[PDB]
Point group: D2
Chain length 333, copies 4
């Protein structure tokens, strides 16, 4: 059974998820088994395929996107995720207007429209995909979803699954709250840290390290160990669009203080790094709501920077246990 | 108590170990604690410091090195490990002549001289540091060491700790046999494999990868997953000397088949990559002979490519247990 | 007015040229002006556009290519230039059998058949695009072309335009002979050389440099160099070229170059350069072939036989040698060739 | 015959120049001929060697540098050019106080003291090596130098040699004025520009390029660019320069450059270039200062006041502008300067 998905923010991430889902649908037609799908960690989570996605509802504020049909809105400037060259289906609907800051309060009429629209579209999951920095919106879309009984997924660093009192409510309603903050499918950081891990595991000394990142999309434009230096915003480069380039240097010291030098360059489709992980959180969301597991799922920990309860309080057994019980409860029901 | 060390082959590795040991001795004088030593995994193994090294005996065949005083022999052309700029001590002795292929047999007089020289120098460890490819020599130096009751350490890919019947003998005499084949302190391979590990751990698809290596020393000159390609001998480059340069490419595929590109360059002092690991094997050797633990030590597994018993049959608990019992038996005695 | 173009060897280079020409034809329709064509230094040469190409004749020895229709032969194994995603047209002919070493001699039945095919197909230019190392074939296809009055283009390091008596005969017969040896559109060695140029021009001292190349096509597999190390002469006592570091199957027709330069500046402090170059190796051919084949055809139309100086900048080994030619020699030949075609 | 050299600003550049000069002095002893000196384009300029330097005078405002003996001041925080491991000599003087913005005016007690110090120290050249952005100081130290008849060298982008009336006065007084703005021995922008040059010279199309720089010294911290993007003009609608990507403390006086060039060749196939440049940023200064200060001194000894054309290749903003000078203009000035010194 397909996930009925609502979207708060129709950016590069949603362009990647929407086009992505129909590329995998096309590969199924062509004759590719999901075992062989590129970029897919779990091809099934509670029986949900990577392609078992229906968009039912969408909220933006941007004039190119509000009261545009969804199909057209996702591809609309200033979105610069590439055309993946797949005839995308028209899912029948038009992007509703989002909450402005003044409509934060659950008693606003805007608020009332969103709650009514989630109820009427029979959404299961609301995907929060806004610009980073809007704490009022993350809270607001989450109470909207909460009141509507719809699972909430926070892609952003805003406190939602991390505000202890809002988690309690979600726990109490049998509603899943997945957050906070996407860990990129394969990001600068996880590569940088693996290499520094290698140096100290084998007993090399770190003299210094730097990592710097370049991007050309709205996300990047918005955001813009003694001798480790991290520059998460080295420069906006318009021609890079939704690509992100990272360059890192490690200077280690080996036997006798001889230098170990590492020079590394990473290029990725930045919003594929989002999609690669949203498609897991989306499915942990839906499968949990269907089986009534409200609050935070430990299945979501490995693909989140700031999960409810914090990384320190979780082993990868906790994670694998949660996938096993979520999948085994669904098989059962 | 200092390790009395014999050396079969006075190459770049021994230049690195000999100079290295006196650089750490100098840092102790200057006022550096061994906690803060660059490139040192275990600063103590059975009470042995990285600087608790006495060369007592040496075998080569090269005219620059045979019947030269050791101090001068290690630095002698065609050795191109750098002068680390430390006044090295003169350990009093001269490099004896090695075994030629015809003197393989334990009944040769050459053989008799080596066995007598290990006995007279009261060596504890014989370090086998010859060119790769000389199976007759690895066997011969090992029987020489065996008869002499002296621990044997194989840096090379030749079968020694891996020939089942020769291990049995070493087991039976209470003599340690550490082998086979050094894993570089931080080599091309361990970096390449960690990065490929990252791609499949997170569920990225590998499209291709290549790794190529460049060197300019005698070792390199001697040696000279469907779409992974490893070129361990991309080219001899004389000006690189004992430096080794590695370049690797990984092309992954992410969500929706978007490319993940990685480009990496590693430069190291290749024979510091040997020294960084010999200094551990050397000490597992000595400490085991002092405490009468003959045969293979599991402590040696993490720093060997082809350990006796094979990597598959060892967990890092086996390794850490063996360090704990070796150190705890020495404290005890 | 389209070049009737004959091909000795249906390799990566002709996959690139044929598909390339139909990609530019497509861009013409979909709207793009030829001044905006990517990778074209000169969009017309004696009024011949980058797309004004009719393949009339093709010669190979590989069983996947012989008696296969051209359209299919160019894409056929082990050719691994990419599919460019253009409706490649069917020119309506098939790859005939080439000369094997024993058919070298002009009175062989092969030789007579080829001189037949060049005359019958009304070819204007024969493009010699065989593997490097086949001196008998370069000579043979060249005398084949001469006999039938068809212009000859040598992609390879083989001696053809450089043998003064064969040049003389071509010169006197009113037939163009263009060679020898393609200088790649953008080659490893011009990049390495330019950077070394910079260091010594501003007086930085060279400690050391290396260049290594990686490839995965039949050309690279065949080559498997002195020209490269001359290029860089600059103290070269510590400059190493590895022109074949290794064959990487999944690169196909891609070529990768990696270079290191270690300078010393004031007080012997290091100036370090690390560079990676990636290119479509056979685009580096076709980007220069399209120049030479048009230099060829327009010259035969205007009866300028022998070597054209317009060919010099895109050749390693032009007839008469680089030292006997300036930029103006090359320009004078382009301007004269274009302007005579005019009248 | 040694240059008596005065310094306005004891930064990384003078750490590099002072230690550099004593490293070459050491190499002379330990045996090395000056033609084998690393990083020296011209080992003599009017018979002045790379080591023929007497520091006589020094002016700063930083408390670690003022009233400290020169020897100690050059190495003093926050100067982070390396120690080169040479016995640096003690020239026997101490860093005097510089001009603060209020002491600009020539009748201030500071100004009078400095004109005192230049006359008393018998300085021949005043090297202006302050931070970029201080137009009042460049003018002030320049009139200070003029009044005392001492040659002036402008390292900075400030208008000095380029203000035509100050030039006129220097010209007429028989005093050399050399400026403005050092072109680094080997700079990011000449590498980027050379590579972009290659692509368009051979007719490859630019899709896109970026250049970013990293540093860790006071110069880089101060700068924290238009000149850079002009250099590269070549379709630059997709060429981005970030001249200050970020300040990395553990780089100190090192500077790192990273560049990307994305060309299109035949049939729009990509030509990709990735480059890393590492240099000792203040060696890139001293490698050119040693040229300018000798151009300065030899010209004052021979009474060639005003701007010398020999200075052109090592300056961004020479008096009269690059467009009014050829390579021969520069050569003619070097050859004349050396040869007059002779007689
Ligand atoms: N791989 C990654 O992209 C990565 C990594 C970690 C976290 N994230 C985070 O994911 C988020 C989404 O990034 P993206 O590339 O999709 O961003 P984007 O900037 O392209 O999309 C944001 C969308 O939200 C819309 N919007 C703004 N205010 C709104 C409102 N009040 N209501 C509804 N819509 C509103 C914008 O108009 C736009 O359509 C960002 O916060 C980013 O930092 C992404
Ligand atoms: N990091 C590394 O260097 C690394 C990695 C893994 C394994 N290894 C292996 O370590 C070994 C030693 O490398 P190296 O750099 O010291 O080598 P090297 O080639 O510099 O030294 C070899 C020495 O052995 C001497 N020799 C040759 N035949 C001899 C004989 N019969 N008896 C005695 N001496 C003899 C040679 O003259 C020379 O002095 C090589 O087999 C290498 O492959 C090294
Ligand atoms: N960047 C470049 O690609 C570049 C640069 C300069 C020069 N060149 C040279 O151009 C030549 C062609 O390059 P390519 O990649 O197209 O090579 P290729 O290997 O792809 O093409 C060679 C073709 O010749 C055919 N052939 C072999 N023997 C023949 C014979 N006797 N008669 C007729 N056909 C025969 C082969 O089957 C194959 O079809 C090579 O010599 C290469 O070095 C290429
Ligand atoms: N590669 C290069 O280093 C390079 C290239 C071209 C131009 N330049 C320019 O040369 C100049 C010097 O470079 P640097 O790295 O030596 O700089 P620095 O910051 O190391 O030196 C500046 C010095 O000026 C001193 N000072 C400040 N105000 C003063 C005043 N009013 N009077 C006297 N002294 C004063 C500062 O304390 C410091 O000692 C900078 O403008 C730089 O841009 C450098
Ligand atoms: Na994004
Ligand atoms: Na070695
Ligand atoms: Na080719
Ligand atoms: Na500087």
């Amino acid at each position: 059974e397909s996930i009925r998905l609502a979207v708060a923010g129709v950016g590069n991430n949603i362009s990647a998820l929407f086009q992505g889902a129909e590329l995998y649908r096309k590969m199924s037609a062509e004759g590719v088994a999901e075992a062989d799908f590129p970029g897919i960690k779990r091809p099934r989570i509670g029986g949900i395929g990577v392609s078992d996605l229906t968009f039912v509802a969408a909220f933006d504020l941007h004039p190119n996107k509000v009261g545009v049909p969804f199909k057209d809105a996702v591809l609309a400037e200033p979105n610069n995720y590439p055309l993946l060259g797949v005839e995308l289906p028209d899912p029948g609907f038009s992007v509703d207007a989002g909450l402005t800051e003044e409509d934060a309060d659950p008693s606003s009429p805007a608020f009332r429209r969103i709650v009514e629209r989630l109820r009427e579209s029979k959404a299961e999951v609301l995907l929060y995909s806004l610009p980073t920095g809007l704490q009022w919106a993350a809270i607001a879309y989450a109470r909207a979803a909460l009141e509507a009984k719809v699972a909430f997924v926070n892609c952003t660093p805003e406190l939602v699954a991390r505000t202890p009192e809002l988690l309690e409510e979600f726990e109490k309603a049998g509603v899943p709250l997945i957050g906070d903050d996407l860990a990129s499918h394969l990001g600068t950081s996880v590569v940088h840290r693996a290499l520094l891990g290698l140096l100290s595991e084998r007993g090399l000394s770190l003299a210094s390290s730097y990592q710097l990142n370049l991007g050309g999309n709205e996300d990047f434009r918005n955001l813009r160990t003694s001798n480790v230096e991290v520059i998460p915003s080295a420069g906006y480069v318009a021609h890079l669009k939704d690509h992100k380039v990272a360059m890192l240097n490690i200077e280690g010291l080996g036997w006798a203080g001889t230098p170990v030098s590492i020079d590394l360059k990473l290029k990725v489709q930045d919003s594929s790094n989002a999609a690669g992980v949203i498609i897991d959180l989306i499915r942990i969301a839906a499968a949990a709501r269907r089986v009534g597991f409200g609050g935070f799922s430990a299945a979501a920990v490995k693909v989140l920077k700031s999960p409810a309860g914090g990384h320190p309080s979780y082993t990868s057994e906790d994670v694998a246990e949660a996938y096993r019980q979520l999948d085994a409860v669904t098989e059962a029901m």
